[PDB]
Amino acid sequence: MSEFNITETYLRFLEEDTEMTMPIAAIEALVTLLRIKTPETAAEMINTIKSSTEELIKSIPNSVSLRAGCDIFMRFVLRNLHLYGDWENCKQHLIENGQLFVSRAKKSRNKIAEIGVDFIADDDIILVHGYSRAVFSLLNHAANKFIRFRCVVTESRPSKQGNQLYTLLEQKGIPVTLIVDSAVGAVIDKVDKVFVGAEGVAESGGIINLVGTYSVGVLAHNARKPFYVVTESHKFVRMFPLSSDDLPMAGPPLDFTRRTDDLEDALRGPTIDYTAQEYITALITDLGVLTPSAVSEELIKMWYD
Amino acid sequence: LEQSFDNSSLISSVKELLLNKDLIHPSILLLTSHLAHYKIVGSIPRCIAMLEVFQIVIKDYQTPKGTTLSRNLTSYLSHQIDLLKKARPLSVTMGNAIRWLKQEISLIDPSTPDKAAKKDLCEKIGQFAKEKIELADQLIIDNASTQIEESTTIVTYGSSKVLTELLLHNAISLKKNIKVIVVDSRPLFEGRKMAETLRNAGVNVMYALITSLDTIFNMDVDYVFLGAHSILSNGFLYSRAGTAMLAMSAKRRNIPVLVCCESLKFSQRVQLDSVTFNELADPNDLVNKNILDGWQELPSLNIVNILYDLTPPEYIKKVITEFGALPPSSVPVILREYKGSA
Amino acid sequence: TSHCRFYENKYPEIDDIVMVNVQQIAEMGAYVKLLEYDNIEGMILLSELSRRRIRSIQKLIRVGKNDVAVVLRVDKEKGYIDLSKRRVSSEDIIKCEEKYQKSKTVHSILRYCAEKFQIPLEELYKTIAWPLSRKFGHAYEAFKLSIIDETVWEGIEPPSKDVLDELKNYISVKIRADVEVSCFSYEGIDAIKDALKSAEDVKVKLVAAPLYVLTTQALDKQKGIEQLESAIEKITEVITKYGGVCNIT
H/E/C letters for each residue in C61-91? HHCCCEEEEECCCCCCCCCCCECECCCCCHH
Same domain for C106 and C165: yes
**Residues of A whose CB is below 8 A from B318:** 240, 242
**Residues of B whose CB is below 8 A from A304:** 323-324, 338
Cβ neighbors of A258 (< 8 A, separation 6 or more) are none
What is d(CA C9, CA C24) in angstroms, rounded to the nearest whole number?
A: 27
Given in angstroms, what resolution was this structure solved at? Answer: 3.9
A78 contacts chain C (CB < 8 A): yes
Cβ neighbors of B66 (< 8 A, separation 6 or more) are none
Residue C7 inside a domain? The answer is: no
Query: Which residue in B232, B200, B240 sits closest to B312, CA to CA?
Result: B232
What is d(CA A188, CA A251) in angstroms, rounded to the nearest whole number?
A: 33
* CA contacts within 13 A on the Cβ side of C237: 10
H or E segment and range at residue C18: strand C17-21
H or E segment and range at residue B226: strand B224-227
Residue B93's alpha-carbon distances to A166, B51, B100, B331, in angstroms, are: 59, 10, 11, 17
Residue C8's alpha-carbon distances to C108, C121, C129, C197, in angstroms, are: 19, 14, 9, 58
Q: C191 is in which domain, residue-wise?
A: 173-248
- Helix axis angle, A22-36 relative to A65-81, nearest 10°? 40
Instruction: List the single residue in B132, B138, B342 with the smallest CB-CB distance to C60.
Output: B138
By the 8 A CB rule, do B232 and B198 touch? Answer: no
What is d(CA B304, CA B317) in angstroms, rounded to the nearest whole number?
A: 31
CB contact under 8 A, B329 and A242: no
By the 8 A CB rule, do A124 and A192 touch? Answer: yes
The count of other CB atoms within 10 Å of the CB of residue C175 is 18
What is d(CA C20, CA C23) in angstroms, rounded to the nearest whole number?
A: 9
What is d(CA B134, CA A211) in angstroms, rounded to the nearest whole number?
A: 42
Instruction: List the single residue in A44, A74, A81 with the smallest CB-CB distance to C45.
Output: A81
Query: Which residue in B180, B181, B159 sits closest to B168, CA to CA?
Result: B180
Experimental method reported for this structure: cryo-EM
- Helix axis angle, A90-98 relative to A65-81, nearest 10°? 140
Instruction: List the single residue in A39, A82, A305 with the smallest CB-CB distance to C55.
Output: A305
By the 8 A CB rule, do A73 and A49 touch? Answer: yes
The count of other CB atoms within 10 Å of the CB of residue A56 is 22
- Choosing among B329, B330, B337, which should be mutated to test the A contact, i.e. which has the most A CBs within 10 A? B330
Q: What is the 3-state secondary structure (H, E, C) of chain A?
A: CCCCCCCCCHHHHCCCCCCCCHHHHHHHHHHHHHHHCCCCCHHHHHHHHHHHHHHHHHHCCCCCHHHHHHHHHHHHHHHHHCCCCCCCCHHHHHHHHHCCCCCCCHHHHHHHHHHHCCCCCCCCEEEECCCCHHHHHHHHHHHHCCCCCEEEECCCCCCCCHHHHCCCCCCCCCCEEECCHHHCCCCCCCCCEEEECCCCECCCCCCCCCCCHHHHHHHHHCCCCCEEEECCCCCECCCCCCCCCCCCCCCCCCCCCCCCCCCCCCCCCCCCCCCCCCCCCEEEECCEEECHHHHHHHHHHCCCC
What is d(CA C128, CA C153) in angstroms, rounded to the nearest whole number?
A: 9
- Total number of domains constituting chain C: 3
Same domain for C166 and C96: yes
DSSP C14: S
By the 8 A CB rule, do B164 and B173 touch? Answer: no
CB contact under 8 A, B330 and A293: yes
By the 8 A CB rule, do B86 and B15 touch? Answer: yes
A166 contacts chain B (CB < 8 A): no
What is d(CA B63, CA B48) in angstroms, rounded to the nearest whole number?
A: 25
DSSP B70: T
Strand partners, C180: C211, C247
Beta-sheet pairing, B257-260 with B224-227: parallel
Domain boundary among C66, C91, C116: C91
| B197 SS3 class | helix
What is d(CA A287, CA A112) in angstroms, rounded to the nearest whole number?
A: 9
Q: To the nearest whole angstrom, how far is the Cα of B299 from the nearest Cα of chain A?
A: 49
By the 8 A CB rule, do A276 and A206 touch? Answer: yes
Beta-sheet pairing, A193-196 with A125-128: parallel
DSSP B309: E
What is d(CA A47, CA A8) in angstroms, rounded to the nearest whole number?
A: 20
Q: To the nearest whole angstrom, how far is the Cα of C62 from the nearest Cα of chain B?
A: 11
CB contact under 8 A, A304 and B324: yes
Residue C121's alpha-carbon distances to A169, C115, C124, in angstroms, are: 76, 8, 6
What is d(CA B88, CA B83) in angstroms, rounded to the nearest whole number?
A: 9
CB contact under 8 A, C28 and A46: yes
Cis amide linkage into residue B187, ω under 30° from 0: yes
Strand partners, B227: B260
* CA contacts within 13 A on the Cβ side of B268: 7
Residue C69 inside a domain? The answer is: yes
B221 contacts chain A (CB < 8 A): no
Domain boundary among C171, C190, C206: C171
What is d(CA A212, CA A229) in angstroms, rounded to the nearest whole number?
A: 14
User: Looking at residue C84, which CATH number applies to its domain?
Assistant: 2.40.50.140
Residue B25's alpha-carbon distances to A139, B47, B54, B79, in angstroms, are: 74, 18, 10, 10
**Residues of A whose CB is below 8 A from B333:** 297, 300-301
* CA contacts within 13 A on the Cβ side of B246: 36
Same domain for C39 and C29: yes
Instruction: List the single residue in B258, B314, B326 with the smallest CB-CB distance to A203.
Output: B326
C53: closest chain B residue by CA? B342
Same domain for C102 and C79: no
Cβ neighbors of B55 (< 8 A, separation 6 or more) are B122, B125, B126
What is d(CA C28, CA C46) in angstroms, rounded to the nearest whole number?
A: 6
**Residues of C whose CB is below 8 A from A51:** none
CB contact under 8 A, A240 and B314: no
CB contact under 8 A, A305 and C53: yes
Residue C101 inside a domain? The answer is: yes
Domain boundary among C75, C91, C107: C91
CB contact under 8 A, B330 and A297: yes
Dihedral angle, C-alpha A54, A59, A60, A66, nearest 10 °? -40
Interface chains of chain B (3 or more CB pairs under 8 Å): A, C
CB contact under 8 A, B139 and C55: no
CB contact under 8 A, B135 and C58: no
A75: closest chain C residue by CA? C27
Residue C1 inside a domain? The answer is: no
Same domain for C44 and C83: yes
Residue C5 inside a domain? The answer is: no
Cβ neighbors of C11 (< 8 A, separation 6 or more) are C37, C40, C74, C75, C76, C79, C81
Instruction: List the single residue in B317, B318, B323 with the smallest CB-CB distance to A304.
Output: B323
User: Looking at residue C116, which CATH number applies to its domain?
Assistant: 1.10.150.190
CB contact under 8 A, A304 and C59: no
Cβ neighbors of B117 (< 8 A, separation 6 or more) are B58, B61, B69, B108
Residue C3 inside a domain? The answer is: no
CB contact under 8 A, B314 and A303: no
By the 8 A CB rule, do C171 and C109 touch? Answer: yes
Same domain for C103 and C65: no
Interface chains of chain C (3 or more CB pairs under 8 Å): A, B
User: Looking at residue C203, which CATH number applies to its domain?
Assistant: 3.30.70.1130
CB contact under 8 A, B330 and A303: no
DSSP B330: G
Interface chains of chain A (3 or more CB pairs under 8 Å): B, C
By the 8 A CB rule, do B92 and B268 touch? Answer: no
CB contact under 8 A, A43 and C53: no
Q: What is the 3-state secondary structure (H, E, C) of C94-109?
A: HHHHHHHHHHHHHHHH
